[PDB]
Amino acid sequence: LIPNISPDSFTVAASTGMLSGKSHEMLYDAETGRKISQLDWKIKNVAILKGDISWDPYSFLTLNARGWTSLASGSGNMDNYDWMNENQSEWTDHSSHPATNVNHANEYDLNVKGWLLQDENYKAGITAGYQETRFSWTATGGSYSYNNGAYTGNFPKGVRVIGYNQRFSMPYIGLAGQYRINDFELNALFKFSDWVRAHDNDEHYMRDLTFREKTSGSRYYGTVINAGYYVTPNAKVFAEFTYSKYDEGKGGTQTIDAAGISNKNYTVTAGLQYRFG
C-alpha cells in the first residue's frame, strides 16, 4: 500500500539544553585481567541542540530520524591512573586535567516504531533502530604524581596532552509508549542492545603515540521521557530527559589487549514539536 503523504502524517521537533556524562578508556593485562590503566573522561557541561523528524506512513508504523549535536565546545575533566606495579593495588601514576574541553559530541538514531496497541489515550509499540554516538575531548595542562609520588608537578598551561575520541554504534530494540489526556502528552521509551560496537582513538601528544581500540558485543541501555502541553492542535511545548549507558566491552588495542571502552550520558532539553497540516 501507498504510504500516507498527508502533511499531518509529518511532525518535526527541536529542543535545546545540556548534555553531561562520563567515559572510561580502560586497559587490562590480557592474562590476569589486572587493570593497568584507566582514563576517566568527564562531560560536565555541553550545550546541545536536539532534532526529530517523524513520519507515519501507515497507522501502525512510524519512521523516525533523531539526534543531537553540541552547539560549541563544552567543559570537561580527565584523570589518568596507571597501575605499573603488578604487586601493588594502588596506582603508581596519576595525572589530573581540569582544563579538558569537550570539543564536540553528537548522536543519531534512525528507527521505526510498530504500534501494536492503541486507544484514544494510549499508543504502545515495539521500536527498533540504528544508533551512533560520538564524543571528542582534548586534555590540556594539569598536574601529575608519578612513580609513587617521587615526581610531582604541573604540565605547562594550555599545552595539549592527550586527545581522545569515542564512538559507539548499535542496532537496538525497545518499547515505546505514548499517553495523551486532553492537552497533556507523555512519551516514554526504553531501548536495549546486546551488540554494541565501540571504537576509540587516543593521541598522546607528549609521546608521539596514537592508540586505537575496538570492542564488540557489549550492552546498551537507554531511556527517553518527555512531557509537554499542546498550545495549539498542532504545536506541543515540551521538556525531555534521556539517559544512556554503554557498558564496557572487551577488545583489542593498537599502537601507531585488553581494552575497554565505555560511556554514560544524560540530556535535559526543552523545545517545541510541530505537526503539519
Binding site: 593497568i36 589518568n80 596507571d82
Partner: peptide, 11 residues
Amino acid sequence: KCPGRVVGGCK
C-alpha cells in the same frame, strides 16, 4: 612500555 600515562620513559 608505559601504558596510559601522559608521558612515557618507563624504564
